[PDB]
Design a protein around this ligand. Structure first.
Ligand code: NA
Ligand code: NA
Lengths: 241, 229, 234, 218, 246, 236, 242, 232
């Protein structure tokens, strides 16, 4: 459609807000990011395409710490993704201020999703060209993983993928029995799936970013250490052959 | 927001959104108002699309204060903004002056609000013409107010579908000192010209205004008037 | 409030809205101003059923400074009122009265701010501000919708202001200056170029050294019409 | 001022005296301190007379707005909440001490509302300068579920004890019974006290300098 | 936002304001409203566009509005816009009265509204008020006065003038018959009905007249009743027929 | 054509053309290079003269004792965004009595420059920065852009003909970390003149250098200041 | 279908008097690909919709269109899910704020009126679009008994004996108007089974427990009960003979 | 139709682009920086002998040690000249010292892209200033001449011109300019280069000249002082 696709304050005759759909295409063109809910936590893996070897490792970090107990993994226009992390950081900080404890992930997902939805209603602003996955572990609430898109929809996921290989990554996740497996195991299988769905012919070389949150980390979102990442990268290369 | 008028003058010299809003009124479910000597009548078509609709729930004929009432043709949601606002304007008069608001003065205040949306920034006007019944100085009052924010005091008039037929029907058949018994009967006969179906207590709505203020008529009260038609 | 950019630059470096405001000046009634030694003069172009007083286009701003205008008459009245306010507000801030340069600079500054601030189209007027300073020197300046200002010996604005300024460029000699009568005659000659049959269709007023403004009625105007046309023959 | 309230079996009764004092001088002998809020909600006015007047006016308008919108008879809990949150924002400077009484969906209800924005739900209460006399009468002879006749008699006896006992209070007992079926406003229900004069001056005794007479054609 | 902007407050290429001109075309369709000055008074006479059998007639007027004790006005255009402007005129009249404790002079009240109308042409991005007003009044400085204004925020003082349907035709007809300095209110009332007979398509329900006069140190504003109008209509019909024979 | 004028308007391609147009402000702007060793961080800037009479354009600016920048784009956006960095540095020295971490300063630029890309009637910052600075984590080169994206770097170049510079730097990466100061500056200078044609090369007029590390605060070298560094290798 | 100006791009009138941007918000409800049904009993009121879980990797608990607004009130949304959540957040705010300001449980008609009045602001102001979603509230009124209340993107609202919204709205309202004309003793069993069979026969699917989700309020238990998959299974097998 | 803060595909603001195009319409001005002083010359472009020549101030005193010459929209310049004049005396108030020529030019350069529609104050700018400024003064770093354009780009210049024949005059400045020359040679160089590009033939009433030395303050040249220099 043409004419009706310039403002988020304008529906088309079909009943579609094309500005929101065009923001979702910037995510579909962006590189693949994934995350799976384990038995004892949640793991994140990201295909970070290196534009130049001139850049340092741990630059353009598409994995972020929203809170001490929550991890954000993003795909889309990265500037928008960082500002969404700043919104989620403050929103989580506001909960601790108001109620004196760590924000629940479903609530954190809902409150940041309504932030994302607000930008899909007006000519005065545009939607966020970014989908992201929020993940967390706790004592009582346990392992939880939610994904949000440019429109502002929030759903909970056992497994989830966003980016270039959205559909291709999901059929590889369906094979894994994530509900029985642990975080220690899942890091190998998350690293495997990125190496599969990575297009070596089309795209340049990449760095695998890995983070996690679980009973291993005492419900704290840390990076996966270099011991375990390089074990999982080795597993990805040799099991590809 | 948008700080510029959406309603503007065309080369002909007509405020096009107001005439387009009048088309929304003109294609609305019809409404009639009649001024007797001893009272005022307001009646309208309440024919919803199915028997599934709860008839007792939402009302077209609505009170503003205990001595003034209201009815419309055209846009229903727009109407509800004007009802809430008119209700406030009545109390804002009563608080200040400790007297029931004159019907002329309520219309003038709601007219000013209806005018506001034909000029102010980033807003279309209302797709509603109001009919406002009342009782002030021991005597009845009936007023129209249409999307422009212009108002006209009527003895009797019609709105919505077949308003031209209702107006000519009324012109010859209205007498300037009718009884309120007869005027209620006339208002239902004006609606039966434009109706498509068998009329009942449910599918039309009537309110009245007299010595003891304004009220909406009950289904059984309407059913008595429908028995002799 | 309305924060739209009204006046902007074009492909070829023109401020189109200021240029269209100057087209609104060129339709308005032909206003003319002339300087002298002892006296300063203004005059304007012109229905039977009107009060002349109400549609007067010569306006006093303070006791010592007045002005004429050409263009949109509503737009003129706001500039005149805000000039009048600034004249008294100047006295309130520094006691001493307004020099003709200062008020012209203010009107220019006001006109310029409307060509650059958001929400606002320019003032569709050019003015001809005249008077006597603190030291007593006579002055004549001219502003336009852009907010540029320049002093003049004499100038025209309005309908056919080229043909009036062409006439003024030739005729402004030291002979016409010396006397109060001769400077007034020069203004009427200049207006007679554009005014199709003059006399009755000419507004005209004067300012002297220490004295305030003084409008000449059509009886006083038709005296100087006789003094011009007799002298042409001889 | 002595105002008081009383919950009985079929409803609520609200009482009030008629004296309005300016310092220690009686300004008004006959005034209504029982104000209309809703059809079956009334309110007694004490403290600052203007603040008692204008708050009860304002909440009445709010209940008319609320009732017209809802299409329902208003609740007595709603008037108490509106008053409180108005009065609390003004920090007691709006000095309206009020006894709010009525009947709704959930039965007969009586609330004491103080000017700082505190409230108390009660079966009997009293407020104003002679509250203590009236409240002493209520404590002495109140029981649960009174008759319509006994409640009027007790509430008249309470407001009368203030009328005589308190210098601020005086005049007649106004009253308002709020049964389930409507509200009976018994104005001048009692008269504890019950003149002579006649100082006829002859026309011309008052000396006059100017006289102007404007006849009224318009 | 920028795409949806009508841009009401801009110069067109010619050097003029489109919405101002287009608003004056709206007035050219609206009812014939005129005013005539005299030595002993001022009048306004207007075409009554609210004309039906079933109209109620609550108010003493329809297009005529009182403003101050010594002032009044009539309108031509969108009547809703007139209700805003007349309300604001009344506010200005009392704002002056509160300040100085005298009635506002007629030119000052007209300039005050015309400064507001001009603002809607210059800034705010808002459409102008589509109303021309004819004002009448008395003050201590200039006495009996008539003023015209229009959507631009421009005003003028007139001896006699017209606005509405057949505006130009009415003014040229007034330019023939009006005699400056020599006209009384009785002679002016004859000319008002003469001009409205030309313009309109003449029953007294379709006409609406009012007369501002000064009687005994106080201004007197009164609408004429339908007995007064109908006898003045028959006097025109007889005076028109008496000339036709001779 | 329809999706070109406003930053809020997403294209059907999934792109915002006003960002990508603002990126071209950097590219048509003059060349500049940045790189780091184990101990230092260096910026080198080809200063573009207007005419040959007029003096050369100032391309390297001071931010703090521990941070400085080199620019490429609109000079007003450069100066605005420079003053933002200067102020946030000043806030940190005022509040904490401790220099602001360079990665944290760079995050605030990204947060700031992103804001107007999402709002109607606003535009991105038409300027790219290379940001040299030393802190508790040693020396850094950071890049920023009109898109509000930022990059941690071993080295980088931006501006007119800067592809030539990036190709030179990508070869000599492992050399930079081991280099002394004079060898690190000489590497940055050789990357810069690769952007130039074969006809013209580096002089004391058209080159500026900006240096910070463990020993030294952010010093800027322009005219006779530069003469020590150039006199070493000059052929091709 | 005549058009001029920006009448299809922003909420302003067409020549005929329609608002095309409002009409497009009704088309946006169908984009969800789901149909909701709501029914009113003698002593209860029930809502039902498609709990469509195509992906096994979704957490099926977090996939829902039924929402709890207060204890005594709950709603089914249908339309754009982001708009649907947003409208629910505002319903919760206004309902809570009502109990703060006025000191009692907001009635179901007034909550539905409040959201409908908010929707009108989008219907009139050009700067924002209408929400492409449709809220059907249920709850037990004390005086008036059980209540079912829909409200549109246009800003209409109405009480219903039964109603539907979404893809197969016209078919669902056609099915319900046939069954309401016949006499039934409208018990909890009668009301629930009419809602499931209406959604079943219109779409032409024999539902499983995971393929639907049910919310309900009774006279005995007026708190908003969302039924489990086990509780849904009992009502499905009760229709084994039909 | 598009916004004021809109980039072209080339990577530059249309309104800034078009503000540079506006300076071509403006009348030409020259400034030459020398060790002995900065001279500044400009054509008045007098359209009528009725117009008073002395009231076209196109060179003006910013301070006792700084001047500024202008081309383009004359009204737009007076806002920037006043802001500079304010800035210097605000600096004198706070610091009890004179500003540098660079510091003044930078202060005016900060105002160049302070325009826009949404997010703005009551008196904030819709468009840029369509004015090129040639600053010229003597501070602690010798005599300095600085150029500014509508973009905000400012730079030191040994010699530069702006206006209709900016292109033509800069070629003449390239040949004529020498870095070790005197002030009086630089003054006469300008009037030679101005006489060519005008073709009204140059005279004392038709132009403004002004100089700033280390010893002497900002001096604008009179009729008698211009008539002495006129032609040799
Ligand atoms: Na007493
Ligand atoms: Na809208």
């Amino acid at each position: 459609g043409t004419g009706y696709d310039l403002s988020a304050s304008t529906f088309s005759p079909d009943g579609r807000v094309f500005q929101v759909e065009y923001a979702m295409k910037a995510v579909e063109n962006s590189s693949t990011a994934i995350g799976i809910r384990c038995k004892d936590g949640v793991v994140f893996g990201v295909e970070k395409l290196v534009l130049s070897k001139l850049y340092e490792e741990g630059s353009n970090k598409r994995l972020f710490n929203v809170d001490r107990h929550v991890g954000m993994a993003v795909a889309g226009l990265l500037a928008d993704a960082r500002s969404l992390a700043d919104i989620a950081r403050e929103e989580a900080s506001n909960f601790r201020s108001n109620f004196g404890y760590n924000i629940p992930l479903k609530h954190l997902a809902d409150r940041v999703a309504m932030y994302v939805h607000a930008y899909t209603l007006y000519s005065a602003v545009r939607p966020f060209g970014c989908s992201f996955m929020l993940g967390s572990y706790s004592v009582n609430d346990g392992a939880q993983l939610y994904m949000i898109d440019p429109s502002g929809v929030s759903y909970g996921y056992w497994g989830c993928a966003i980016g270039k290989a959205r559909q291709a990554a999901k059929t590889e996740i369906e094979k894994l029995q994530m509900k029985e497996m642990t975080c220690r195991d899942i890091v190998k299988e998350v690293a495997k799936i990125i190496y599969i769905v990575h297009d070596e012919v089309k795209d340049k070389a990449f760095e695998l970013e890995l983070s996690w949150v679980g009973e291993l980390t005492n419900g704290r979102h840390e990076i996966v250490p270099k011991d375990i990442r390089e074990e999982a990268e080795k597993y990805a290369k040799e099991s590809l052959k | 927001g948008y700080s510029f008028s959406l309603t503007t003058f065309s080369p002909s010299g007509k405020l096009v959104q107001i005439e387009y809003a009048l088309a929304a009124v003109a294609g609305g479910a019809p409404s009639v108002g009649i001024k007797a000597a001893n009272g005022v009548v307001l009646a309208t078509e309440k024919k919803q699309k199915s028997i599934l609709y709860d008839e007792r729930s939402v009302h077209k004929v609505e009170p503003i204060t205990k001595h003034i009432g209201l009815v419309y043709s055209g846009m229903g949601p727009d109407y509800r903004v004007l009802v809430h606002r008119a209700r406030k304007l009545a109390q804002q008069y009563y608080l200040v002056y400790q007297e029931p608001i004159p019907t002329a003065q309520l219309v003038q205040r709601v007219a000013s609000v209806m005018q506001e949306y034909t000029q102010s920034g980033g807003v279309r006007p209302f797709g509603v013409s109001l009919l406002i019944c009342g009782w002030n100085e021991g005597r009845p009052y009936l007023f129209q107010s249409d999307p422009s924010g212009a108002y006209f005091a009527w003895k009797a008039t019609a709105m919505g579908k077949n308003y031209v037929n209702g107006k000519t029907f009324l012109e010859k058949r209205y007498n300037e000192d009718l009884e309120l018994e007869d005027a209620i009967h006339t208002a239902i006969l004006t609606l039966k010209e434009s109706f498509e179906g068998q009329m009942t207590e449910d599918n039309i709505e009537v309110g009245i205004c007299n010595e003891a203020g304004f009220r909406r008529l009950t289904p059984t009260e309407v059913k008595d008037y429908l028995a002799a038609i | 409030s309305y924060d739209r950019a009204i006046t902007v630059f074009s492909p070829d470096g023109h401020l189109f809205q200021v240029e269209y405001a100057q087209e609104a000046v060129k339709k308005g009634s032909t206003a003319v101003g002339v300087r002298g030694r002892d006296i300063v003069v203004l005059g304007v172009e012109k229905a039977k059923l009107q009060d002349e007083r109400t549609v007067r286009k010569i306006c006093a701003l303070d006791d010592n400074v007045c002005m004429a205008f050409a263009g949109l008459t509503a737009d003129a009245r706001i500039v005149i009122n805000r000039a009048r306010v600034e004249c008294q507000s100047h006295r309130l801030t520094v006691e001493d009265p307004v020099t003709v340069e200062y008020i012209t600079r203010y009107i220019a500054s006001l006109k310029q701010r409307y060509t650059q601030s958001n929400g606002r189209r320019p003032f569709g007027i050019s003015a001809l501000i005249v008077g006597f300073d603190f030291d007593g020197t006579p002055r004549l300046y001219q502003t336009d919708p852009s907010g540029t200002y320049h002093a003049w010996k004499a100038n025209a604005i309005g309908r056919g202001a080229k043909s009036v300024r062409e006439f003024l460029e030739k005729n402004y000699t030291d002979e016409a200056i010396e006397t109060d009568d001769l400077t007034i005659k020069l203004v009427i000659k200049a207006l007679l170029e554009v005014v199709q049959s003059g006399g009755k269709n000419i507004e005209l007023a004067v300012m002297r050294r220490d004295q305030s403004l003084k409008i000449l009625n059509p009886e006083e105007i038709e005296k100087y019409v006789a003094e011009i046309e007799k002298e042409k023959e001889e | 001022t002595t105002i008081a309230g009383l919950v009985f079996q079929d409803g609520v009764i609200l009482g009030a005296d008629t004296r309005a004092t300016n310092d220690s001088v009686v300004a008004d002998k006959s005034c209504e301190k029982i104000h209309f809020i809703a059809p079956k909600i009334y309110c007694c006015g004490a403290g600052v007379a203007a603040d008692a007047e204008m708050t009860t006016r304002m909440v009445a308008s709010k209940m008319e707005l609320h009732a017209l919108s809802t299409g329902r008879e208003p609740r007595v809990a709603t008037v108490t909440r509106i008053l409180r949150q108005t009065l609390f924002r003004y920090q007691g400077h709006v000095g309206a001490s009020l006894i709010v009484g009525g009947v709704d969906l959930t039965g007969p209800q009586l609330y004491g509302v103080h000017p700082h924005g505190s409230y108390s739900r009660l079966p009997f209460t009293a407020l104003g300068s002679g509250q203590d006399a009236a409240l002493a009468v209520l404590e002495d002879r109140f029981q649960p579920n009174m008759t319509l006749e006994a409640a009027q008699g007790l509430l008249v006896e309470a407001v009368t004890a203030g009328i005589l006992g308190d210098l601020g209070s005086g005049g007649n007992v106004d009253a308002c019974v709020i049964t389930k079926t409507g509200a009976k406003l018994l104005r001048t229900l009692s008269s504890p006290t019950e003149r002579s004069g006649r100082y006829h001056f002859v026309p011309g005794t008052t000396a006059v300098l100017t006289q102007t007479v404007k006849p009224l054609t318009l | 936002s920028r795409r949806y902007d009508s841009r009401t407050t801009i110069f067109s290429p010619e050097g003029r304001l489109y919405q101002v001109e287009y608003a004056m075309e709206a007035i050219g369709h609206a009812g014939t409203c005129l005013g005539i000055l005299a030595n002993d008074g001022v009048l306004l006479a207007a075409e009554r566009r609210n004309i039906h059998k079933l109209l109620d007639e609550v108010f003493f007027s329809e297009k005529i509005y009182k403003l101050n004790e010594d002032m009044a006005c009539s309108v031509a255009g969108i009547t809703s816009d007139a209700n805003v402007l007349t309300n604001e005129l009344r506010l200005i009249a009392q704002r002056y009265l509160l300040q100085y404790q005298e009635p506002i002079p007629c030119e000052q009240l007209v300039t005050a509204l015309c400064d507001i109308k001009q603002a809607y042409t210059q800034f705010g991005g808002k459409r102008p008020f589509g109303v021309s007003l004819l004002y009448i009044g008395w003050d201590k400085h200039y006495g009996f006065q008539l003023y015209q204004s229009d959507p631009s925020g421009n005003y003028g003082g007139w001896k006699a003038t017209c606005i509405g349907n057949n505006s130009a035709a009415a003014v040229s007809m007034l330019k023939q018959d009006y005699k400056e300095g020599e006209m009384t209110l009785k002679s002016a009332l004859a000319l008002a009905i003469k001009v409205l007979n030309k313009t309109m398509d003449l029953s007294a329900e379709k006409v609406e007249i009012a007369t501002l006069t000064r009687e005994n140190g106080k201004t007197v504003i009164r609408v004429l009743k339908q007995k007064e109008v109908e006898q003045l209509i028959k006097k025109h019909e007889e005076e028109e027929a008496k000339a036709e024979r001779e | 054509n329809q999706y070109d004028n406003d930053v809020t308007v997403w294209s059907p391609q999934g792109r915002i053309h006003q960002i990508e147009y603002a990126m071209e402000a950097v590219k048509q702007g003059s060349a500049t290079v940045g790189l780091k060793s184990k101990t230092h961080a260096v910026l080198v800037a080809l200063k573009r003269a207007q005419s040959e009479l007029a003096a050369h354009q100032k391309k390297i600016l001071h931010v703090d004792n521990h941070i400085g920048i080199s620019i490429a784009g609109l000079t007003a956006d450069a100066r605005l965004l420079c003053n933002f960095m200067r102020q946030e540095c000043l806030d940190s020295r005022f509040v904490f009595d401790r220099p602001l971490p360079v990665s944290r300063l760079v995050s605030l630029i990204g947060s700031k420059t992103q804001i107007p890309t999402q709002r109607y009637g606003r535009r991105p910052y038409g300027v790219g920065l290379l940001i040299a600075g030393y802190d508790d984590m040693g020396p850094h080169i950071f890049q920023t852009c009109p898109s509000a994206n930022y990059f941690d770097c071993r080295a980088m170049s931006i501006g007119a003909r800067s592809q030539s510079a990036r190709t030179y730097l990508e070869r000599h990466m492992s050399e930079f970390m081991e280099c002394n100061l004079n060898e690190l500056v000489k590497h940055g200078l050789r990357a810069l003149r690769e952007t130039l044609p074969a006809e013209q090369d580096l002089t004391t007029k058209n080159v500026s250098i900006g240096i910070v590390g463990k020993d030294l605060e952010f010093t800027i070298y322009d005219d006779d200041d530069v003469s020590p560094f150039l006199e070493g290798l000059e052929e091709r | 279908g005549s058009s001029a100006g920006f009448d299809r791009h922003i909420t302003i009138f067409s020549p005929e008097g329609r608002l095309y941007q409002v009409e497009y918000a009704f088309k946006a409800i169908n984009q969800g690909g789901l149909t909701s049904v709501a029914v009113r009993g003698k002593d209860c009121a029930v809502i039902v919709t498609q709990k469509k879980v195509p992906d096994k990797l979704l957490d099926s608990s977090t996939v829902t269109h039924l929402f709890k607004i207060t204890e005594n009130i709950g709603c089914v949304m249908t339309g754009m899910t982001a708009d649907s959540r947003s409208q629910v957040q505002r319903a919760r705010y206004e309902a809570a704020n009502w109990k703060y300001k006025y000191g009692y449980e907001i009635p179901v008609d007034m909550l539905c009126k409040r959201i409908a009045d908010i929707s009108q602001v989008y219907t009139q102001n050009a700067e924002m679009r209408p929400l492409g979603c449709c809220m059907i509230l249920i709850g037990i009124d004390e005086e008036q008994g059980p209540q079912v209340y829909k409200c549109d993107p246009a800003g209409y609202y109405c009480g219903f004996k039964a109603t539907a919204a979404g893809v197969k709205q016209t078919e669902s309202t056609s099915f319900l108007e046939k069954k309401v004309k016949k006499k039934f003793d409208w018990t909890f069993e009668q009301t629930v089974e009419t809602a499931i069979t209406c959604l079943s026969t219109v779409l032409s699917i024999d539902f499983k427990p995971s393929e639907i989700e049910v919310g309900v309020v009774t006279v005995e238990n007026p708190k908003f009960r969302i039924l489990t998959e086990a509780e849904i299974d009992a009502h499905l097998v009760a229709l084994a003979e039909r | 139709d598009r916004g004021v803060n809109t980039f072209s595909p080339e990577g530059r603001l249309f309104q800034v682009e078009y503000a540079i195009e506006a300076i071509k319409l403006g009348s030409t001005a020259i400034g030459i920086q020398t060790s002995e002083g900065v001279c500044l010359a400009v054509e008045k472009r007098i359209t009528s002998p009725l117009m008073e020549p002395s009231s076209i101030e196109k060179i003006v005193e910013i301070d006792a040690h700084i001047g500024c010459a202008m081309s383009g929209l004359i009204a737009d310049a007076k806002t920037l000249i006043d802001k500079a004049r304010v800035e210097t005396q605000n600096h004198w108030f706070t610091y009890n010292e004179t500003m540098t020529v660079e510091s003044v030019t930078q202060a005016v350069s900060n105002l160049a892209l302070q325009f826009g529609e949404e997010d703005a104050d009551p008196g904030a700018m819709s468009r840029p200033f369509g004015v090129a400024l040639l600053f010229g003064g003597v501070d602690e770093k010798g005599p300095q001449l600085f150029h500014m354009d509508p973009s905000g780009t400012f730079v030191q210049c040994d010699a530069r011109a702006i206006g209709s024949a900016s292109e033509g005059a800069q070629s003449s400045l390239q040949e004529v300019y020498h870095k070790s020359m005197t002030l009086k040679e630089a003054i006469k160089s300008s009037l030679i280069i101005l006489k060519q590009v005008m073709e009204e033939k140059l005279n004392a009433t038709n132009i403004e000249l002004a100089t700033v030395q280390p010893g002497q303050n900002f001096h604008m040249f009179t009729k008698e002082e211009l008539e002495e220099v006129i032609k040799d």
